[PDB]
Structure formats: C-alpha cells, structure tokens
Amino acid sequence: LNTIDIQGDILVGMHKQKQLFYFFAINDPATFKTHLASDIAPVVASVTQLSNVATQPLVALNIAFSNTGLLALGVTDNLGDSLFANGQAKDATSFKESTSSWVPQFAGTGIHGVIILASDTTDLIDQQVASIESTFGSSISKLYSLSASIRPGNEAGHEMFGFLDGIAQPAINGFNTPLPGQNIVDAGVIITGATNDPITRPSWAVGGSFLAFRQLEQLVPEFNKYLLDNAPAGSGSLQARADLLGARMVGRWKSGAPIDLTPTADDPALGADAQRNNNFTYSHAGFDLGSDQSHCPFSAHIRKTRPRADLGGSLTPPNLSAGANSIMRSGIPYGPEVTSAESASNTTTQERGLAFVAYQAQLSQGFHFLQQTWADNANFPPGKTPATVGLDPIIGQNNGQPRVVNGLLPSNSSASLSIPQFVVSHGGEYFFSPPISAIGGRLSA
Ligand code: HEM
C-alpha cells in the first residue's frame, strides 16, 4: 500500500466533529478540471496525513466521483464494477426498497460527485466551501448537501439510536495492527488495484475505493417506544429490559459492549476497551452454534453483517471468515438531537439519521451484498434452528413494511416479532474515491 496516495476517509476516517457532504454536478469539464488540479487535488487529505494527529489539517477534504461525473470528465475507462456504472438508483430494487422515498436529486444520475469536508467547526467548513464555489465558479453546481456531526457529550461516537459506533473495521493485512477478534483481509478487498484485488482497474484507479453513500433516516422516538413496549420480563427496570432488547437487535449494547460477550446486562467498561470489545466469534464453549441464540440472536445487526463463525473458520478469535465481504465504515450522524416533545409523543417531527459511508473495492461483495444477501435474507445465516432467522431488525428491508425478526427474545428463541421500519432509506449514490495522484492527474487532463 501507498498510503500517501490514498484518501484518508477510506482507511482512517476524517475523525472531525463536523462533516459536510457536498453533492455536485460538472457544468463545464474544461474549467472544472483546471480548478480540480489547483484548488482541490493539492489539499486532499491522505491516509498517511490523517494517521498522525500532528499532520491533520484544520479541514480534511476528500472527493469522489459517480459514473456520470467520470463521464462528464471525459473518462470512460471500465472501473470494473457494474453496480457503480449503473448508479445506486438502478440498484434500489435489490434491497427491496424503491426510489420513492429518495431525495429526488439521488433518484437519477445527475449527481457527478461528492466533496467530503470535515472540520471541528462548521465555520472552517463553510470557509472552504466558499473558496471552492468562488474559484470553480459556474464550472461546478451544488445539487444537494448534507451536514453531519458527531453527537454531543457522552453520545459522541454514538449513532442516533444511541449505540457506540465505529468499533469494528477490517484490519488490512500489512497495514493495520490487528485487534483481538478483528478480521484480517487483503488490501484489495477495500482498495482497488491493491494486493489480491482480482478485478482489473484502470491505471489511474490504483489506490482508490468505491464509496457507497446512503442517507438513512432513523425514527428514534419510535424505536425507543418499540423497545419499551416489547421489553422482555425479568429483573431490573423497564428501561434496562428495553435496553436489552435494543442490544439484542444491534448485537452490541449502547456502550459498545458486544452482547455475545455480555448477553444479559450491559458492561460499559467493555465497550471502551478496544482490546476486548471485538474479541468474539459467536462460538461458545458448551453451546450449539446452530441453535444457541442465548448470547446473540442470529438476526442481530452485526451478526448479519459480519457472520464470523456462522460462515465457518476458527471458533476461537480471530475468526477470519468472509474477508472478501468486509467494508470500511465512515458513517456520521445527521440532524438535530431528539427533543422532549418528540420523546413525549414517541413521534419524530424532524429528520435525523446516519450519513452512511461504506468503502470497498467491489460493491457486489461489500455494501450491496451485506444489504441484499445477508441483512434482507430471512434465511441467512444458513443452517440455523429455527432456520428462518428473519431480517436484520436495524437495516433489513421489506418494501417499507414491518420486518419479521426471530430469535430476539431470550426466553423463547422461536418467538417472532413484527417490527416496523426504524431506518428509512432516502437513498444515495455509488461514488469512486480516486487515488490522490489521479485527481490532479488523469481526472484533470
Ligand atoms: C441507520 C442505519 C444503521 C445503523 C443505526 C447501524 C448501526 C450499527 C452499530 C450500532 C454497529 C455496532 C458498532 C460497531 O460494531 O462498529 C454497527 C456495525 C456494523 N454495521 Fe451498521 N448501521 C446502520 C447501517 C448499516 C448498513 C446499511 C450496513 C451494510 C449494508 C451496515 C454494516 C455494518 C457492519 C459491517 C458493522 C460491523 C460488524 C462487525 O464487523 O462485526 N450498517 N452498525
């Protein structure tokens, strides 16, 4: 790997308090290219730079292009990815959703790219945006944007449902020092043209990655109310038992504690411990892997998206199964905190959610595969008893309607729940984040 030439959000994440997703079209390739080379390319933050606190810019900038943006730039080379080429709108029906609920700018292929601006204040971001718009002039056009932020206080690093996020990533072999239980993968799973990437890419694409962007609204008061209404009977407060159900749905407690290691009560100390909070496989000493949902439901979100021992491999950490289906996640929450009024009425009045960002070298193996073949598949994971696992309670989709999810109730692993959508996709796009040398190189030529 040459982490000098790889955009930082791909392998490191921007790790700033604020981010802006600036979605643009290219009006005029010729003028746009000039300013791409002079104004954008030299300030794109790399993995190497973001990997050291002393070399992190006040504004971390990354930029990615859609198939039609690349077309607008006169670049027609085959990036080796049909899903990217066709755009996410065309792919929506693969996830049993429709472009009906999408931001209208996303329901098409008019968006040519996205600029990711990140800084610890919104002030610095808007300065950089004002400069970009000034210098590019009418060669660029803003079609849509989404402002996002780290949540405040003790919810920093947690997503809108309140769960600590950004714990689990694939370790890239030869680059990351793997953590206990962490999967270890070839660089080519995430970085196009890198080690063991079987797909031929254009020359200017080596060091890049596909960026799956999803604007995912979360119905937080509704979720909270559902958990309280369905809290399993037992010891502790109603909220504690409600939290237990929530944790069974995610596969982690709000603290980050993986339920597979903490199956009856939260242990917040575990969530804060990078050396132990991923050290599991779903295998347990005296339990049948195929039928035991006492530690973690077969349908739990993280078990659906990283099956670990459910797809074979070592029963002791680290489990190394399904390395090719790993994704890097750089998502960040958007929208305001939940208000008292919303909580009292258990009803959302304004949009908040996750600005979901997934990187992978193959869309068909990454985001698209986890959503369609695993999360939305009522019979995944395979070989379980009962065999009908049901859907991912967090992201599983059923054309807008309630999702049948099994195994969630600790007192009865055959008990089914009919769970309304908590996450409402408003769509997004598939982009390609090029290596930095390509931005001021071929893409500006
Ligand atoms: C609003 C929607 C979503 C929410 C609230 C959500 C929430 C979470 C949470 C709380 C975790 C645990 C933190 C961690 O392990 O790092 C997690 C992990 C993860 N999620 Fe999601 N997520 C969402 C969307 C998605 C989507 C759309 C995908 C893929 C299609 C996805 C794939 C993953 C993966 C791969 C992990 C790590 C699993 C592992 O390595 O064990 N998430 N998510």
Author numbering: 4 to 448
Question: Can you quote the paper on this entry?
Answer:
DyPs (dye-decolorizing peroxidases) (EC 1.11.1.19) represent a new family of haem peroxidases widespread in bacteria, archaea, fungi and other micro-organisms. In the present study, we expressed A. auricula-judae DyP in E. coli, solved the crystal structure of the recombinant enzyme and several site-directed variants, and used PELE (Protein Energy Landscape Exploration) to describe the binding of its typical substrate RB19. The DyP structure is formed by two domains, each of them including an antiparallel four-stranded large β-sheet and two or three helices resulting in a ferredoxin-like fold (plus two additional β-strands). In spite of the obvious similarity between the two domains, only the C-terminal domain harbours a haem cofactor.
His-304 (Nε) acts as the fifth ligand of the haem iron, with Asp-395 at 2.66 Å. To identify the possible substrate binding site(s) in A. auricula-judae DyP, we performed 160 PELE non-biased simulations, where the typical DyP substrate RB19 was free to explore the structure of the recombinant enzyme. These simulations show that RB19 encounters several favourable docking positions on the protein surface, with local minima close to Trp-105, Tyr-147/Tyr-337, Trp-207, Tyr-285 and Trp-377 sites, as well as in the haem channel entrance. There is a clear preference for Trp-377 to be oxidized over Trp-105, Tyr-285 and Tyr-337. Finally, using QM/MM methods, we were able to map the important residues along the LRET pathway from WT DyP Trp-377 to the haem. This pathway would include a first 3.0 Å electron transfer between the Trp-377 side chain and the Pro-310/Arg-309 backbone, and a second one (2.9 Å) between the Arg-309 and Arg-306 carbonyls, followed by the Arg-306 to His-304 backbone to reach the haem iron (at only 2.2 Å from the His-304 side chain). The EPR spectrum of the WT DyP resting state (top) shows a ferric species prevalently in its axial high spin state (g⊥≈ 6 and g∥=2.0). After adding 10 eq. of H2O2, a strong decrease in the ferric signal, and appearance of an intense protein radical signal are evident (bottom) (the electronic absorption spectra of WT DyP, and the EPR and electronic absorption spectra of the D168N and R332L variants are described in the Supplementary Results and Supplementary Figures S4 and S5 respectively). The yield of the radical observed in the spectrum of the H2O2-activated WT DyP is estimated as 0.58 spin/haem. Simultaneously, a mixed tryptophanyl/tyrosyl radical was detected by EPR spectroscopy of the H2O2-activated WT (wild-type) DyP.
